[PDB]
Point group: C2
Amino acid sequence: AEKPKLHYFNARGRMESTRWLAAAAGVEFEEKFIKSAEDLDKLRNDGYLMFQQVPMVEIDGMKLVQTRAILNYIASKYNLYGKDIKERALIDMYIEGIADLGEMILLLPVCPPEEKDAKLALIKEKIKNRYFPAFEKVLKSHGQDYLVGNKLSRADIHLVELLYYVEELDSSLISSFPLLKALKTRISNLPTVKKFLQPGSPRKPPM
Amino acid sequence: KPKLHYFNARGRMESTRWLAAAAGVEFEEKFIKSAEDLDKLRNDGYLMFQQVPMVEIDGMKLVQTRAILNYIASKYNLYGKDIKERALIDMYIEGIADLGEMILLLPVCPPEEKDAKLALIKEKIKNRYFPAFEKVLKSHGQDYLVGNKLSRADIHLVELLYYVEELDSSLISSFPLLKALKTRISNLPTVKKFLQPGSPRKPPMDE
């Protein structure tokens, strides 16, 4: 078959969690960077973007836009979405929480300086009182190596992706959560993830 | 019977009310009225991220809108036949949610920004979203968005068409197929029942 093709800017943005997930799944893919406005216009004009926006991933005859659509399909194809419907609910619950926190951090740079030193305080407070304790609690509930069904899933990947960004913001934030640390160590040590974390992978830098 | 915990309002629960009801599911609701109605669910451990919507369903307490919806869509055979169908469904409904979201928080928009944000929402409706969906209907000529059969995508799009009608009734005017769909979907027994006075269908907010 043809290798999936990822169309985005040569940046993290809204395409990174897809890069992490496909790499974690050991899926080989090609990137096509948008590097000019005219490049993006090429895409619209050719009819490649349903809602005129990227990320778009070409995969299995499809031109999938919308991060959640692209990720849902990849997680499913490569068996990282639970073994049943109830497992998918826990997974969706977890990863939607991660997306919410993700979202905040993603857009934190593109706001005013006036709204900034409170939005940061508000992010850090939610990490430490809402988000991190909830994932710790889940890992403590079962004592197992993965978040769901004692098997690696997209929740592990997306959370560990998130714990990497949380590190860049403030490395002290995980410090009271030992099981999250252990998870971040365990997942970074999986062969595919470890390859992704190595220099030269498709992992992107911060802005 | 599933139990919706939300405020007595549309909010982030309404699209679940539509979907439950389209699928012939009787649910109960439990309305939060005070900040200490909310505060009870948090300390009771009922909310994973201390937030509503929450649905009690099949022994789970599911939070996050997308988790609830995905679960209900699959359980009631409204999520397509396979992963490729779901992907087209996901692509479509995430587009819908993106527009839904802009419309959902128009009321809470800073008042000096409201004029531009409203004007931008209409531009997107007219140029981005409504044509994408007209083009889909026109490409297969079939009565439903996906798989020649009822899916959550038809339900979510129709719901949106009603919020767009409340905003500006001219917007749908040159989208014949969107018009045709809104009509056919609103005459499905369960939906017609939902649109009738005295259902769990919630009003627009006003203050």
